[PDB]
């Protein structure tokens, strides 16, 4: 936290944040959502961290360097220590990236090492080579060298992600699954876990061993698991919540913007809301059925009339405002909704479904007031526009995630937020063997395009290929893009440090401070 001069801080330096759902885990190797990451950035610190404007900055590494984007050398600060006063060494990173890669860990993010293209990643994941073969090395206790198979200029960018955070050899080996229990956890971020009560709260407290302890202002932070955006908003209104989750209820939003307008933050967010189709199950394995659903959805109504929070209607997976994206708007998007509907009617007919002999399927959503509102609207539009019968089902956040991965669904509400600001953050998720591939989409052609991005002679060449890769997904109608998110949440007047200027929303509680009020 960098407290301005004019600022007169409060006595109690504590914060309460809504975290949207009960997290999958606190183990950095077992998580994949936004909620999990919120908490992780507070507890575990990797090589780099994001500053308040979302730019990669020194974390555990103080300085780093690369030899042609292929060999990267990280110089670890000598004062970095764990929760228990033990130092953070190069060896911690060696062990942690190995465990992430290890097929046994079954991390939903194992593929992250593939995205960075660390030497031998393929075979390890494949199980042909042991994780010990990873192209990572502790040169000495304070030197961590990374060897890649190709030149990746944006490599350092990936490093602020929790999956590449170090984990404690000791606790892990000693307690296994129970290592994250408060009595057993060892952390290296600004905070330590004080308390964890499932479906009630997670309470964090200042970690005095953090190398940057003198700049930490908030002594305690509480994370709540409230999935009802309305409840969040009520409780914030009561004055029990300082910063809500960044999902705003469609019901109250307009109200809010008029009564407490300085507390309503609405910033650009590098996320895409979409309806994911299980690509491997009949009849969704047919591109005509996929395309009809993509086309029959009326983005206009959903974005501008139903929701109405400032999101942008989407035509791609990768948000067009991502660093390095030069996208082409598809022709279907430039049409009239009735033109799209007619087209859509036709594709489905061709596929064998008409309003007389219709298609019926399940639309899965994670429990949420916002998501439920939308799914209803969407099911209505497809009924209206296509004569399809949609059956709504909802699951709990961690169950919802697991279903997606299992492929025991039809169509699901989905969202993907960038982990780094570069097109591959979105694109790598569609790789046939990607651990994050929950569309169950497999395109050799798509694979080859992405693969080619790391074999190019220059940067321009790179971006044309990313535009080509998006055209392919769209061709295949892998998904149904809906909108490009706005980051909209309520922040009490006394919370300092929340700029809203990081499109990744990678907030660190060590960066906020309470003002006298």
């Amino acid at each position: 936290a960098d407290v301005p001069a004019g600022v007169q801080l409060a006595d109690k330096q504590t914060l309460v944040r809504n975290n949207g759902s009960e997290v999958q885990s606190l183990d950095p190797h077992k998580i994949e959502g936004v909620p999990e990451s919120n908490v992780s950035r507070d507890l575990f610190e990797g090589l780099l961290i994001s500053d308040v404007e979302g730019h990669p900055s020194p974390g555990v590494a103080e300085k780093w360097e690369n030899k042609d984007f292929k060999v990267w050398t990280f110089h670890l600060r000598e004062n970095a220590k764990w929760s228990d006063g033990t130092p953070v060494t190069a060896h911690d990173f060696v062990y942690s990236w190995q465990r992430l890669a290890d097929p046994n860990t079954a991390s939903p993010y194992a593929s992250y090492l593939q995205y960075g293209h660390i030497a031998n990643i393929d075979d390890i994941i494949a199980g042909k080579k042991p994780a010990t073969d990873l192209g990572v090395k502790a040169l000495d206790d304070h030197t961590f060298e990374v060897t890649l198979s190709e030149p990746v200029p944006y490599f350092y960018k990936l490093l602020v992600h929790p999956s590449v955070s170090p984990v404690p050899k000791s606790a892990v080996e000693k307690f296994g699954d129970k290592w994250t229990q408060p009595a057993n956890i060892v952390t290296n971020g600004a905070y330590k876990l004080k308390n964890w009560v499932v479906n009630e709260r997670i309470v964090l407290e200042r970690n005095p061993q953090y190398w940057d302890n003198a700049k930490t202002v908030i002594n305690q932070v509480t994370y709540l698991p409230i999935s009802s955006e309305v409840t969040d908003v009520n409780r914030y209104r009561s004055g029990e919540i300082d910063m809500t989750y960044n999902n705003m209820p469609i019901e109250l939003f307009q109200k809010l913007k008029k009564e407490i307008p300085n507390e309503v933050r609405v910033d650009p967010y590098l996320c895409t809301y979409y309806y994911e189709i299980n690509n491997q199950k009949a009849p969704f394995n047919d591109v005509r059925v996929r395309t009809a659903l993509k086309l029959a959805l009326d983005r206009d109504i959903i974005v501008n009339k139903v929701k109405n929070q400032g999101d942008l209607p989407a035509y791609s997976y990768t948000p067009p405002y991502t660093d390095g994206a030069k996208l082409v708007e598809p022709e279907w998007f430039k049409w009239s909704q009735q033109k799209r509907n007619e087209e859509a009617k036709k594709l489905l007919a061709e596929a064998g479904f008409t309003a007389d002999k219709p298609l019926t399927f399940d639309l899965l959503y994670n429990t949420s007031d916002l998501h439920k509102k939308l799914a209803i609207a969407v099911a209505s539009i497809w009924k209206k526009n296509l004569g399809v019968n949609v059956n709504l089902e909802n699951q709990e956040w961690k169950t919802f995630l697991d279903t997606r991965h299992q492929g025991t669904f039809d169509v699901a509400r989905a969202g993907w937020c960038a982990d780094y600001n570069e097109p591959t953050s979105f694109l790598n998720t569609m790789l046939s063997d990607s651990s994050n591939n929950t569309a169950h989409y497999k395109s050799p052609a798509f694979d080859k395009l992405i693969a080619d991005t790391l074999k190019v002679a220059d940067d321009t060449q790179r971006s044309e290929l990313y535009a080509k890769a998006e055209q392919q997904l769209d061709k295949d109608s892998a998904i149904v893009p809906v909108y490009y998110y706005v980051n909209a949440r309520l922040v009490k007047p006394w919370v300092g440090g929340y700029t809203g200027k990081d499109p990744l929303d990678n907030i660190y509680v060590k960066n906020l401070y309470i003002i006298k009020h």
Partner: peptide
């Protein structure tokens, strides 16, 4: 990451 997946958003809630």
């Amino acid at each position: 990451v997946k958003p809630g």
